[PDB]
């Protein structure tokens, strides 16, 4: 019997990096958020409002909410993954292999699962 106002402040966003400090190709990951929601710990899976997955059926955009896992939490700072990559943005070359349509404003509302 609790409220369903699960929101998050801050803007999680990472872009497809060409190379890192070693100068090798990078598949960027993670996304750290300061949550207004729940009080999460490591091991949750949830969907965020505005984050819609892509290429479920070979570059098919279906608008299905992307599910995230928790890797690390430091207070109300949750490091989540899979990362968020906009197929409608990012870059002409790097967007086709992105995982979601867009990276929404701030962090937005969350639908928490313990499954």
């Amino acid at each position: 019997g609790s409220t369903e106002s699960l929101t998050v402040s801050g803007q999680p966003e990472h872009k497809v990096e060409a190379k890192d400090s070693n100068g090798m190709p990078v598949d960027n990951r993670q996304g750290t958020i300061t949550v207004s929601a729940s009080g999460l710990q490591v091991g949750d899976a949830f969907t965020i409002a505005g984050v819609n997955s892509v290429h479920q059926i070979t570059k098919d955009t279906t608008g299905q909410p992307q599910v995230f896992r928790v890797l690390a939490v430091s207070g109300t700072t949750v490091t989540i993954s899979p990362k968020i990559l906009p197929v409608e943005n990012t870059d002409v070359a790097s967007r086709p292999y992105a995982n979601v349509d867009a990276k929404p404003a701030e962090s937005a509302a969350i639908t928490i699962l313990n499954k």
Side-chain angles (χ1 to χ4, degrees):
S2 57
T3 58
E4 57 182 3
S5 54
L6 304 179
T7 58
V8 181
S9 304
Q11 298 176 298
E13 55 176 357
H14 297 300
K15 326 313 172 317
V16 182
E17 301 180 300
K19 49 68 180 303
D20 57 60
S21 183
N22 191 188
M24 56 181 179
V26 184
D27 186 299
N28 64 299
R29 66 181 189 299
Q30 298 176 178
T32 54
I33 56 182
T34 307
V35 300
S36 304
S38 299
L40 299 178
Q41 300 179 60
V42 185
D44 298 304
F46 59 66
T47 55
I48 297 181
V51 186
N52 296 178
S53 55
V54 303
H55 62 186
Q56 180 60 298
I57 312 305
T58 56
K59 286 64 182 303
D60 189 4
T61 55
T62 60
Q64 298 177 297
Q66 180 59 59
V67 183
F68 305 112
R69 296 301 185 66
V70 182
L71 295 304
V73 183
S74 55
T76 54
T77 305
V78 184
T79 305
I80 60 180
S81 183
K83 62 293 189 298
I84 305 175
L85 299 177
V87 183
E88 299 297 355
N89 305 64
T90 304
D91 182 62
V92 183
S94 296
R95 69 183 190 65
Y97 55 63
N99 53 60
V100 298
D101 293 299
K103 62 188 184 304
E106 57 181 301
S107 300
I110 304 182
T111 302
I112 298 291
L113 286 65
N114 299 299
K115 182 179 61 180

